[PDB]
């Protein structure tokens, strides 16, 4: 999510990066689950909190990417990128219903409220 920042206005590359993000999030979950077993030769709650915070940070970054500009709203690359991000967020919420609650407790700017509700 810290790439060249020019792919934000690029639907195909954005979808590729979203697929990679989901894959690497699952890989990080698996890596932590395997690392907590190869240690001490509680920690499970710490790992769960870390994974929840990481998913929440990823969701927040994906939401902040949906911002229009730095300063048509329907026919542009921004629309397709927002739709892809909403699709990934819907998949994440279907996978885990707790990250949605954690993100809503953390909050996000109101400019994304009519987009996530009507997109997810």
């Amino acid at each position: 999510l810290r790439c060249d920042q020019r792919v934000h206005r690029c639907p195909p590359l954005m979808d590729i990066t979203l697929h990679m993000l989901n894959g690497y999030l699952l890989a990080s979950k698996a890596y932590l689950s395997a690392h907590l077993k190869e240690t001490e030769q509680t920690r499970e709650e710490l790992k769960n909190a870390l994974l929840a915070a990481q998913d929440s940070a990823a969701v927040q970054i994906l939401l902040e990417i949906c911002l229009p500009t730095e300063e048509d709203n329907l026919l542009c690359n921004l629309r397709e990128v927002q739709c892809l991000i909403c699709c990934l967020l819907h998949q994440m919420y279907i996978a885990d219903p707790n990250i949605a609650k954690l993100v809503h407790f953390q909050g996000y700017p109101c400019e994304l409220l009519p987009l996530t509700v009507a997109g997810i």
């Binding site: 001490e40 920690r43 710490l46 909190a49 870390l50 915070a53 927040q60 953390q106």
Partner: protein, 534 residues
């Protein structure tokens, strides 16, 4: 024993001319009173208690079985928020002071009234100026409520006890300059609703107006703590028969001062039995009085009383000694004293002592005599007929003195009343249970009250949460306690903390220390292989 009563009411939030509120000044005055009393080498047995203007479960902050540490900790965190419920607080304090009285034997109400069984207690009742409220309006009477009397309290009919003095501080500090400093050595009265309640017990009520006056009143209050023997005097009935060196004409009649019964527990005998005629069969006992209504008569009546009678030195505190000093302190002469309210079967008062002064003419010695001394002191079947004029139970203590010579009496007629013994152990057990229940839930507050009570104006059961002071959010353990601003940096911090695999991991981000950081406490948990032999 000293029970400080600090209201901590919402009216104690107004700022003085120095810059601190009245509550801060009261706490500072309490601390300086502590450091002043610590100068006298007698503060190794007293115990400090705290009473605030809160609910009965929350009014007491530190009571029995509480050391000085928790008392200072509770007085430190006092918050001034609430109404001025003076009557309920005074009642709670008096009930707290009378928890361990019906179990040890003090005020047994069946065997005289022993003055050598003392439990001193001084109340300060530091409150505001005036305008006390009771959640409905502003009262001007200060009547103590009577809603739930303690088991065994109907035998005194008064909340305070034999030795329970009540001093008061109003803290009437001006807000601009407090420039009233005309009278240097003068401490006037407050003239408020607490003044009669204080004067009834036997203690005055100071009127704090300046910090200098506060220091003066605190330095004058430390000299008014001793054994509590408070008895009331009356002029009746002699019409001021003090025709010894001048002519009488007075205010030194209703003297309700205290007496210093210094020990040599206190040692003494011959107590003031009671004020009524006790019958052999009496289911209900008449309620006693905290202050005995004893009256003196100005008669010489052979003041020379020399015998092997056990001696007593209950020193009387000089408060109304002007009437005695007007007659040259009555040299080599005394005046009898007698308790009223049917001291015998059929008579009005029986002389049982006198108030002879010492040779140094400093104070009154309060020579306490037997129930009827001028007859037994000067057997031809005389003592058997003489022992019928004295109360029955009164044969208890006097016989001990007869033990110094012999033992002619026995336990045949040593019976007060067949009905007085009954219904007494149950009352003592109930009082002990109440004292245990009060001392148990004394520091455990367990408020658990945080809600907004959302009204309609999930239904009828919702309540928004309130801001918790001592929340201690777990940033590493709980993910909900991480705000949005410092989320990525905190995420990396948690990641590095979990992937470090260090020793003795914790869930706190930055927990430096508590409010106190002692040097010896931290140095004790260490090892130093050194002794400095050189």
């Amino acid at each position: 024993i000293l029970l400080f009563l600090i209201d901590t009411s919402a009216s104690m939030n107004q700022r003085s001319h120095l810059g601190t509120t009245y509550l801060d000044t009261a706490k500072g005055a309490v601390e300086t009173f502590m450091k002043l009393r610590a100068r006298d080498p007698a503060s190794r047995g007293d115990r400090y208690m705290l009473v605030t203007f809160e609910e009965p479960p929350y009014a007491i902050k530190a009571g029995w079985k509480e050391n000085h540490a928790t008392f200072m900790n509770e007085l430190k965190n006092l918050q001034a928020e609430g109404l001025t419920t003076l009557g309920q607080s005074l009642r709670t304090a008096f009930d707290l002071l009378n928890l361990n009285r019906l179990v040890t034997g003090i005020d047994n109400y069946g065997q005289g009234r022993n003055p050598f069984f003392l439990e001193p207690a001084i109340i300060i009742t530091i409150t505001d100026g005036s305008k006390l409220t009771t959640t409905s309006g502003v009262q001007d009477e200060l009547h103590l409520p009577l809603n739930s009397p303690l088991p065994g309290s109907e035998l005194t009919k008064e909340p305070f006890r034999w030795d329970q003095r009540l001093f008061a501080l109003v803290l009437r500090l001006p807000g601009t300059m407090s420039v009233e400093s005309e009278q240097l050595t003068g401490v006037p009265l407050d003239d408020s609703a607490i003044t009669p309640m204080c004067e009834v017990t036997g203690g005055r009520s100071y009127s704090v107006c300046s910090p200098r006056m506060l220091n003066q009143c605190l330095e004058s209050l430390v000299q008014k703590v001793q054994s509590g023997v408070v008895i009331n005097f009356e002029k009746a009935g002699p019409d001021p028969s003090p025709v010894e060196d001048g002519q009488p004409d007075g205010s030194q009649p209703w003297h309700s001062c205290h007496k210093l019964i210094y020990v040599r527990v206190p040692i003494g005998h011959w107590p003031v039995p009671e004020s009524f005629w006790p019958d052999q069969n009496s289911p209900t006992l008449p309620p006693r009085t905290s202050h005995p209504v004893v009256k003196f008569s100005c008669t010489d009546c052979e003041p020379m009383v020399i015998d092997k009678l056990p001696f007593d030195k209950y020193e009387l505190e000089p408060s109304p000694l002007t009437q005695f000093i007007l007659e040259r302190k009555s040299p080599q002469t005394c005046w009898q004293v007698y308790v009223s309210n049917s001291a015998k079967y059929s008579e009005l008062g029986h002389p049982f002592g006198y108030l002879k002064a010492s040779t140094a003419l400093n104070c009154v010695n309060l020579f306490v005599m037997p129930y009827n001394y001028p007859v037994l002191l000067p057997w031809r079947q005389s003592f058997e007929s003489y022992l019928k004029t004295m109360p029955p139970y009164y044969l208890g203590p006097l016989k001990k003195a007869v033990r110094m010579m012999g033992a002619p009496n026995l336990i045949a007629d040593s019976m007060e009343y067949g009905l007085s013994y009954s219904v007494i152990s149950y009352l003592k057990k109930l009082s002990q249970q109440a004292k245990i229940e009060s001392d148990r839930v004394i520091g455990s507050v367990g408020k658990k009250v945080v809600q907004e009570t959302g009204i309609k104006v999930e239904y009828t059961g919702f309540q928004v949460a309130l801001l918790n002071k001592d929340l201690k959010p777990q940033t590493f353990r709980n993910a909900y306690d991480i705000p949005r601003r410092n989320l990525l940096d905190h995420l990396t911090r948690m990641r590095s903390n979990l992937l470090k695999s260090t020793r003795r991991f914790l869930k706190g981000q930055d927990e430096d220390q508590v409010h106190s950081v002692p040097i010896a406490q931290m140095g004790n948990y260490q090892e130093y292989l050194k002794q400095v032999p050189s």
